[PDB]
Design a protein around this ligand. Structure first.
Ligand SMILES: *O=P([O])([O])O[C][C]1O[C](N2[C]=NC3=C2N=[C]N=C3[N])[C]([O])[C]1[O]
Lengths: 1006, 77, 77
């Protein structure tokens, strides 16, 4: 091999790159321990694709292990964890053999592996031995442990490790306008270089400094946002013009210390800077847990036990006396913290397991590839804010004891009652893709919605595609084509039969067009809502419904290794919509049409050409031939009249009869777009042309293009014709000659060689806009007369193409890649391959399971706080992560903005005047004066004005006695439709001082 | 007359010169002059808190050599 | 009574007459009187930095024979 399957690994490949994945596919990974933590790690690594995965866990499955081990069932009790899990891991990814290691008595077996991961089933003594062996043998070692709401991980990649790309970001690149002798590089107009001190760059196309372009790297000294310095360039010549710089990521060698050395001298990465003082406390704490087990026959402290918690505190205290430097001189042991670590030691919590499962899986992929920056080397974590208020859900040995249930080790932390409230929750999940699958898995593990008063509703309108399987682990190859929500819900019922009959899988899109489905009664019945979406529009819509119905919303997002979480709490926080994200960049039309300088510009151009050739053209012909008023409507209603009519004229005068005709057409299009149009451009603006100011027209970011001479042996010329021909043929219902084969060059050659290609004649009156701002873009009459009458074309129909980026046989990406590349050859832009073209034209979002798991983990630590109806904003946490760095940051949600009228405080997002019934206008005005001290001044329903304090008596008499619905009918002339149950009214009002004041809106309940 | 740092979600480190009485507003505009992002789109967090427009660096106990984080909401999933 | 140079994106060098105590506005206005570009559209940089309208050439140790860079704020093309 040396071969990567794109149809499976597409979105992951945009995250890691081919090289990193090729190294992964030569790495053997071993995982020790298959409770929840181990199987999460294993799930993500197997999905990612490594050479092989081996699991070692000979312990018998016990009921409690089902707390977070989503591949165990009660049928498995008694059997070995490793064996039972092996077969289920194996289905995740047919390219990855999964084996079981029967024994670990001989440590030498570890030499078979490149990465060894030791989870919570391995004692600290065995961890140290194993690490010593791995480190001294050049095997990469990682360990992790979760205990209740606490966890850690440790990374040791040996004495010598090379990072090849520290961040996974695209290299920065830009156009140069000047390079002074001292090395000062100034950017071409309002472009920011984006570099950082000590980055490296190479150059191309710099004129006057020729050996600057040979691939040598120069070290960047940043002068400001618009310039950087590279050191004298006198020896190289004198700058004249042009130039592009490209950042180059250089290898970096690093060293890790052994577990033994780090136990006494840890290097910390923080998980939450608001808690940095805790890392050192917990590093002592986790060690103390092991000393406790050594002293007590392998057992951890017992749940909520005071006796054992004091012992753990003593143990930690002993450590800090012996090693004053760990907490620091004078710094006391945080006893409350150590106490909870003891109380929760046996806890096995899905959100924490998911967090470390995703994080550690990602570190395994770093260790295999040199892609991204390893955690170096200890990270500690807690989510103590997830604990419920003890007034509501008291915690103690009675309340927290086991009940012979799969949920025992969640009850160990939260108590039986809290766990029951989790069961009786009613929740809406919007989306059943990557986040959706992880989300349903966590909820299956929590028992969420499994109680007689609980339920889950999940909705997704999309079906399962092949690339989904790489990060949506509830789906299997046999499931491709089925509905995500339906298959997901079956999958998690298999994991936890308590949910049988409790999940309602729906197939609807959520938005304004489905409110008759997701109505008042549906929303009001929910306890809360969870997003699992992939577009900003759906998020905004849900956020708006949640505000209106006053339901909490748990929000999350990913992009490659980056992710975020947000909480939205009624009467407490800002909502999703309260804040703005940076918007999509927009390419000026002139740049696309005439002056491209980036492959992005040529890809967009080619994408529009594709659309016009094989979709718009066909739809236009079909309309013209079935609507006798089509022209008349075009002439008056189209901005681009000329274009639409030309499309139809052309589509009907060519008319191919065989496949050979399709080839002829495509070859002629090549001449038009890559030869004649370019000659036409050079006719209006010769290379050496100047402007109205004496200055060279082809300069700055305009590259002077050169026409193309067709060359069947050039890959891009060839595919432009092959894809154009086959697409044309499809439109016209003609059988392709490459319909059951690959395309034969000599066959194409033969047809093209006998063609006679018309020569270029310029058009001396053509004008081309140079600026967007500028203008402008008797003949149309002749155009219309040229059109054939539909009478001639009875039954004639064209078959339009629907763009489909993920079918490699359909010629679509083949066409856009080739078409973009030809135009790139015109303008001396480097060509791009199919993968890069698919990415840009298909607008694919890079995605990986590791980030998806971890972010879903954080969401589920926040969920606990909803179950306790927490009203202290300080307890909630918005998360921000980048697994590449690795970075984790958290912040308290922003408070909802407040207002005041007549000294009465109100919430500007959440508060509203609820009104019962189709109230009369006069009654509404009086209600507001008497009960709110507000003089209503303006009343409106949507876009129509219903009442104003400045209305004359005639108007007032027509309106004051009308129920609101009747008032709306009176003004809009449209009645209210029956499905409508609420009406939102906006008002302006004066307060008791006679001043206009901002107030809440009104909801009328019909 | 102090220095602070702003790390972005992509790993970039920005250095600023500020006085302890500067507003969040002030700081965000310095980030605009340096990064091109407009203040409305910037999200800055420090020590558990998101920084709000009307306050000062002093209100969040930001000291010299402190590191702030500029973060983003992601749209995929 | 001194001379400085301003380079644009097309390779053009503009010659101006200024005193070291002139403000950046002045320079932007002087560019208008000679080249026709208006002040609102000019963004001037010297040694990597954008020059603020209220300061002087002296505040940036810009000397006679010095070279500034002129950008137009970007829009169309
Ligand atoms: O990020 P992924 O693609 O893995 O998962 C997203 C998931 O969300 C679904 N979705 C997008 N927009 C939606 C929606 N579901 C319901 N309503 C709306 N408006 C999409 O189909 C994916 O499966």
């Amino acid at each position: 091999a040396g071969e990567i399957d794109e149809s499976l690994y597409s979105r992951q490949l945009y995250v890691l790159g081919k090289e990193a994945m090729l190294k992964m596919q030569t790495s053997n990974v071993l995982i020790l321990g298959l409770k929840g933590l181990g199987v999460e790690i294993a799930k993500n690594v197997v999905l990612a694709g490594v050479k092989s995965m081996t699991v070692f866990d000979p312990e018998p499955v016990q009921l409690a292990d089902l707390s977070t081990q989503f591949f165990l069932t009660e049928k498995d009790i008694g059997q070995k964890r490793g064996d039972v899990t092996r077969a289920k891991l194996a289905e995740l990814n047919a390219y990855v053999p999964v084996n079981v290691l029967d024994s670990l008595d001989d440590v030498t077996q570890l030499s078979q592996f490149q990465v060894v991961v030791a989870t919570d089933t391995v004692s600290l003594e065995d961890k140290v031995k194993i690490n010593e062996f791995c480190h001294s043998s050049g095997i990469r070692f990682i360990s992790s442990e979760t205990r209740g709401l606490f966890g850690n991980t440790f990374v040791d990649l040996g004495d010598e490790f090379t990072v090849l790309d520290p961040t996974g970001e695209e290299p920065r690149t830009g156009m140069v306008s000047d390079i002074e002798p001292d090395g000062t590089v100034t950017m071409l107009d309002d472009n920011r270089h984006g570099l950082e001190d000590g980055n490296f760059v190479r150059f191309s196309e710099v004129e006057g400094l020729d050996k600057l372009n040979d691939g040598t790297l120069f070290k960047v000294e940043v002068l400001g946002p618009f310039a950087f310095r590279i050191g004298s360039v006198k020896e190289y010549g004198e700058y004249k013009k042009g130039g592009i710089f490209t950042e180059v990521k250089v290898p970096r060698k690093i060293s890790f210390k052994s577990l033994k050395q780090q136990l006494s001298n840890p290097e910390f990465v923080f998980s939450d800077f608001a808690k940095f003082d805790r890392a050192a406390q917990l590093h002592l704490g986790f060690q103390a847990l092991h000393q406790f087990a050594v002293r007590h026959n392998g057992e951890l402290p017992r749940t909520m036990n005071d006796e054992d918690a004091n012992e753990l505190i003593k143990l930690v205290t002993d450590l800090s006396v012996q090693q004053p430097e760990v907490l620091g001189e004078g710094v006391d042991v945080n006893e409350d913290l150590i106490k909870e670590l003891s109380y929760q030691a046996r806890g096995d919590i899905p959100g924490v397991v998911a967090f470390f499962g995703g994080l550690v899986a990602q570190e395994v992929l770093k260790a295999c590839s040199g892609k991204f920056t390893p955690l170096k080397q200890f990270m500690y974590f807690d989510s103590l804010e997830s604990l419920p208020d003890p007034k509501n859900f008291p915690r103690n040995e009675k309340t927290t004891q086991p009940v012979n249930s799969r949920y025992d080790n969640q009850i160990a932390v939260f108590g039986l009652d809290f766990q029951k409230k989790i069961a009786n929750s009613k929740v809406f999940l919007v989306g059943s893709g990557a986040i959706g699958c992880e989300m349903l898995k966590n909820w299956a593990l929590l028992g969420l919605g499994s109680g007689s008063d609980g339920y889950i509703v999940v909705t997704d309108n999309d079906s399962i595609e092949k690339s989904n399987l790489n990060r949506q682990f509830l789906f299997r190859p046999k499931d491709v084509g089925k509905n995500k929500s339906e298959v997901a819900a079956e999958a998690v019922c298999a994991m936890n039969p308590d949910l049988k009959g409790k999940i309602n899988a729906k197939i609807d899109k959520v938005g304004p067009e489905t409110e008759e489905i997701f109505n008042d009664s549906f929303w009001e019945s929910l306890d809360f809502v969870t997003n699992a979406l992939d577009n900003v529009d759906a998020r905004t819509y849900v956020d708006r419904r949640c505000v209106f119905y006053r339901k909490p919303l748990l929000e999350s997002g990913t992009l490659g290794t980056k992710g975020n979480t947000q909480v939205i709490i009624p009467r407490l926080t800002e909502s999703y919509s309260s804040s703005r994200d940076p918007p999509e960049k927009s390419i000026p039309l002139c740049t696309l049409r005439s002056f491209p300088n980036k492959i992005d510009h040529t890809i967009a151009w080619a994408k529009s050409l594709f659309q016009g050739y094989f979709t718009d053209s066909a739809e236009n012909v079909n309309m013209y031939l079935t609507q006798p008023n089509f022209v008349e409507q075009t002439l008056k209603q189209s901005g681009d009249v000329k274009g639409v009519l030309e499309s139809i004229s052309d589509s009907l005068s060519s008319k191919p009869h065989n496949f050979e005709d399709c080839i002829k057409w495509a070859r002629l299009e090549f001449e038009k777009k890559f030869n004649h149009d370019i000659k036409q451009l050079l006719f209006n603006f010769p290379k050496d042309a100047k402007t109205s100011n004496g200055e060279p027209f082809w300069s700055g970011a305009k590259r002077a293009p050169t026409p193309l001479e067709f060359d069947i042996y050039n890959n891009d010329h060839f595919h432009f014709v092959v894809a154009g021909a086959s697409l044309r043929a499809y439109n016209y219902g003609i059988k392709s000659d490459d319909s059951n084969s690959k395309p034969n060059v000599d066959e194409y050659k033969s047809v093209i060689d006998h063609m006679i290609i018309p020569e270029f004649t310029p058009n001396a009156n053509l004008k081309i806009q140079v600026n967007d701002d500028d203008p402008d873009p008797d003949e149309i009459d002749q155009l219309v007369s040229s059109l054939p009458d539909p009478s001639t074309l009875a039954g004639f129909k064209l078959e339009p193409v629907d763009f489909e980026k993920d079918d490699d046989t359909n010629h679509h990406i083949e066409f856009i890649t080739a078409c973009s590349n030809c135009r790139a050859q015109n303008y001396f832009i480097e060509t791009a391959d199919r993968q890069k073209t698919k990415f840009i034209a298909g607008r694919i979002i890079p995605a990986i399971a590791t980030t998806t798991s971890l972010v879903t983990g954080l969401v589920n630590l926040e969920l606990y706080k909803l179950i306790d109806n927490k009203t202290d904003i300080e307890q909630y946490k918005n998360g921000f992560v980048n697994l590449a760095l690795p970075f984790f940051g958290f912040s308290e949600p922003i408070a909802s903005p407040k207002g005041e009228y007549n000294n009465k405080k109100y919430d500007k997002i959440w508060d509203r005047f609820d009104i019962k019934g189709d109230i009369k206008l006069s009654d509404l005005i009086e209600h507001f004066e008497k009960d709110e001290g507000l003089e209503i001044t303006m009343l409106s329903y949507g876009v129509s004005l219903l009442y104003a304090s400045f209305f004359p008596p005639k108007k007032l008499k027509e309106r004051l006695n009308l129920p609101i619905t009747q008032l709306v009918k009176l003004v809009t002339k449209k009645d209210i439709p029956a499905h409508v149950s609420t009406m939102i009214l906006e008002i302006c009002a004066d307060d008791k001082e006679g001043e206009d004041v901002e107030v809440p809106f009104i909801t009328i309940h019909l | 007359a102090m220095q602070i740092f702003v790390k972005t979600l992509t790993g970039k480190t920005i250095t600023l010169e500020v006085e302890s009485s500067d507003t969040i507003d002030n700081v965000k505009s310095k980030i605009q002059d340096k990064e091109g992002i407009p203040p409305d789109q910037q999200r800055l967090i420090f020590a558990g808190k998101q920084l709000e427009d009307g306050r000062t660096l002093s209100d969040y106990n930001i000291q010299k050599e402190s590191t702030l984080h500029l973060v983003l909401r992601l749209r995929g999933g």
